[PDB]
Symmetry: D4
Subunit: 160 residues, 8 copies
Amino acid sequence: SAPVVGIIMGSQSDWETMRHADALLTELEIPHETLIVNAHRTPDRLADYARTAAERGLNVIIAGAGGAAHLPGMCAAWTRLPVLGVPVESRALKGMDSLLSIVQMPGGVPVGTLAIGASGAKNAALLAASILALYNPALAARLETWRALQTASVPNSPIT
Amino acid sequence: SAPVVGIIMGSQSDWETMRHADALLTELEIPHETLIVNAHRTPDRLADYARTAAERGLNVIIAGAGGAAHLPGMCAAWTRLPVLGVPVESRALKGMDSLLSIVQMPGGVPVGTLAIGASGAKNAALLAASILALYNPALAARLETWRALQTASVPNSPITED
Amino acid sequence: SAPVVGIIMGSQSDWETMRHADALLTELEIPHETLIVNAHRTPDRLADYARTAAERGLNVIIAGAGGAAHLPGMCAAWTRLPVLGVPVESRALKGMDSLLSIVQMPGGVPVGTLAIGASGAKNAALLAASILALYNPALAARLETWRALQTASVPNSPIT
Amino acid sequence: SAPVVGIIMGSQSDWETMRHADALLTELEIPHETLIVNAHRTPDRLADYARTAAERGLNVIIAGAGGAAHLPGMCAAWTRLPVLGVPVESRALKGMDSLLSIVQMPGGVPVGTLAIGASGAKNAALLAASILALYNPALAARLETWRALQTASVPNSPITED
Amino acid sequence: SAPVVGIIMGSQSDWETMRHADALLTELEIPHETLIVNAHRTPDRLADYARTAAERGLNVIIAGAGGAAHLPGMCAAWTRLPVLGVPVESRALKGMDSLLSIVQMPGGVPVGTLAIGASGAKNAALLAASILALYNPALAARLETWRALQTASVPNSPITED
Amino acid sequence: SAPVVGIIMGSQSDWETMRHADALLTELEIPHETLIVNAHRTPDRLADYARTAAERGLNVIIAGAGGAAHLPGMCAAWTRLPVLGVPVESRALKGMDSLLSIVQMPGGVPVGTLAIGASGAKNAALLAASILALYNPALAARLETWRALQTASVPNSPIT
Amino acid sequence: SAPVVGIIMGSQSDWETMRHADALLTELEIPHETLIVNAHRTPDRLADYARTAAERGLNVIIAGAGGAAHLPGMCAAWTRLPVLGVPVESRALKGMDSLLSIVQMPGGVPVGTLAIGASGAKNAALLAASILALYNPALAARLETWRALQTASVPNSPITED
Amino acid sequence: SAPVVGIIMGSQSDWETMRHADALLTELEIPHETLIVNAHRTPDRLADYARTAAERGLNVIIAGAGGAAHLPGMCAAWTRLPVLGVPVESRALKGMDSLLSIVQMPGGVPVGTLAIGASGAKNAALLAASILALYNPALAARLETWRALQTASVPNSPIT
């Protein structure tokens, strides 16, 4: 089936983080594509990807980047689709540079930003799912089940 | 007529920021409600608002809070709807406490976080609009027009006179 | 005996930190319960726990959380008991996110916040003990002994 | 009549912040004393105040300090009473130095720390009240009334007019 | 006559900062152009400006941006010319978001970053001048004179009167 | 051939970082010298190095330092050549001290600052190359090739 | 009569801060000189000042700088005298860049660093006084009197009126 | 011989850092004492130590602490001697808490603060030495030699 979510990242090194978004979308059976698109090394690839995303049938883009993290913001610049940004943990500054360069978008071009690291990648997929669930009843039911299981599965006490 | 976006905030002091979300939704002709829901002073009000939002017909919640900013995250805990968070600028720490309190949600319960302050509020409304536009062709057209006009309206050079 | 302190945390991963609170309360023979309550995954469990804490005979709640750490503040929202918050060290931001999301409570609903990590968990238990000692003479004497031993046991010089 | 809470601070400049603790204790009818004790300029005064607090009948100490804020931690070093710390906002670093200097106590000597500034001072008094209410039923009733009124007084919607 | 340095910025609000770069280039008689290019609102304008800069005869680009400051880095992505970045001071985070967004470029695409604010803008122009002076002897002489005068003009003692 | 770029650093411990600048200059066949010059321990060596750099035929200086990182700024003080600064990652503060002490130069004496760590060292060499390419056509072509290969070599998808 | 402390700073703008060091030395009757030495604009002036300070009879150097604050560290590089550093508050980063640039000296060349701003300048003078008092009994007596008076002058309670 | 410098620290865990101060003083043959004094656990020990330091013949105190680091400031409160503070690297916040709680002393009671960690401990000893050298000619000559050797020993190029 045709992808409705695009997951993009700038390098193989981002995959350790973004694989968590990929896994969640697969778990919820949301058709998606997972690609490398680098804002700095392949800016024309980025322009083409973002500009054509809507006409290709994409509904949400999840973009991960670390350091001076420009990939989500520049993606949002070229598409009217919702763009969700995952700050990848950077070696020196632990993703604080990633976080500020993604979340601090000036008014007019938004990026919905999630937590630094694996938690953010998982949550970007969940946020994408909740967006798609607004107009897909079967997915809405699967997301309901996912959240219910998450809630029900929390133990009552720690193991010592 | 019925609201499809809920804008919530903890206090009147937040309105100076959240009014920018309200204005943009109105500009794009998106029906919405604006309420005060305080995570710490009215936690049962929050639980009820969030847990009933979907059945009331809301599609997106925009939540603003400052300091130890728990309102967006706790809203997301009770709803399956997308929740967007606006960090309100705080006096001492300039919204850094607001930002980290909102964006650093552990995996399992998301909040899509926007920039600190008025920019974030405007962008939360634009993000909400982009979500709604996925299923609403008239709104999708209004949003494309809005984005195209924003692009066309950027001047080519600064005014450089003394 | 019935618990007078509740120790709560959002996940098993918090136990490495919160076990230090548990150990100290046991050392001082303070009856307590140690539970998992997750603000985000089990918010109704949290509401019920905090709302009924006083009528169950709890006197102090010690709550640990990391990241966007909402557990202590939301607990305080539903109870009139003193709530003490332990910021758990987070992977990327080393508990600075945990610390700010716990300590920066707006006026009207307090959380007494302790240091990031194991030190904070130990100190939350000690702070709970000093609260209980105000109206329990036998405990006050044991706490006096604990503090005296801590003071007396500090060596006079380092081992080389 | 005799004080059961001590509010201490290093200088008159701290009073702008600590007065919020004082006001709240008075509102809840909690007898207290307010003193200046400077950790660095009057260290022997601090030692004496802290080491005699319990025998003088104090139950809780609220200590405020800014910058390299050592007053709460050193107070806790000499008393077995619960000590609550209020980081006072500093000029350059906006109370971040105050906060870290107070909250990051190594294990063994606790300080329950509240928010930077006026919010923290008000909350230190509320936390002190919640501690005292554990053994004082009349105060417990006054505190429940206060919290209930705070909850009931939150408006349902912001004032949104231009 | 033709420009050899391009000064670009995302909005008119940046000019208060970037005007210091403009003034210094003029002082050193370096022909330049000043334009608004917004990375987020006019991304195709940016692509075209950056990809054609070298063939248009530009030698150095000075780019200023604040907040999530992507303009310098994205300019460098499309040009082989040296790109110098000026972090513009932002309201909440005082240009720290600007600074990290510009300087923390991953290996492979450089931006030479200067200080936050007006100092950085002046220094971007001086750095551009020092690059151009490597091949332009008349400019090298003007720059040496400028640096020598800066050194000679430092007073020996402060004015200490009350 | 005579060096046109100088790479300087304060200690052997900086070499793990600055070797990336050295490798890139060699890859692009840019003649250079790689030296230890310590701002604090050998300040007269620094003064002489920076003061004579231009007359020796150097065109760009790349200077790396960590902690209270004064080497780039003080180099710039004595030369009219462009000075590029690489913040070396420090043990405690992860190069945030290095970054601020290099980039925050007051107006009048510039240092072009690159990212913390190995990325910054590589990018300082690339920035130096782009400066030299302005007036060396053969190098400009090699830099074009380098950038083109970087762009072309980015994979289209991650390896799972 | 001859100076035993040198107070140096990079510009007149630093004097608003460094004047507090000057005033305290005068109060304690410590002969000193006050000069402008800019690490970046007058590096040879700095080298000469620092390398000759000991033979000129100086015992302590107090150096103030803001931003990328290199003056204290580079002074210490050329002198064997104790060098005390005062971080001057900067506009954007509130002296955090000043502080880290001064205090984070690698092992081998020390700078004793004081607080950001006016407090640090006053304390640099007091620290210089405490160093000089080790060998000067009259000054040691004046310093003890000063510290004793500081202690005696702390009020017992705040002024709490409305 | 009687100690003229006191090195104090709050716990054995600080010794890994403060041993560098001890080693430097021994290298320069400066008589000193190395002690554990904990501001929070042994405050009366601290009061007595600082109050009597001058009359015991101490000239400089070097105090190391981490976290909420109160030891140097409180030492300075009770003595007119120069007090030098070493921020010990803390687990979570990497000594940023240590640094701010030591350096940000309000006007009236100074602490001369050195770098976070081992570098700061070494430099506190060197700063103490330079203070003592003002009125001890033999030590001044040894310190001159130490600094000269440090300067002369810096290599001219890195080892590859």
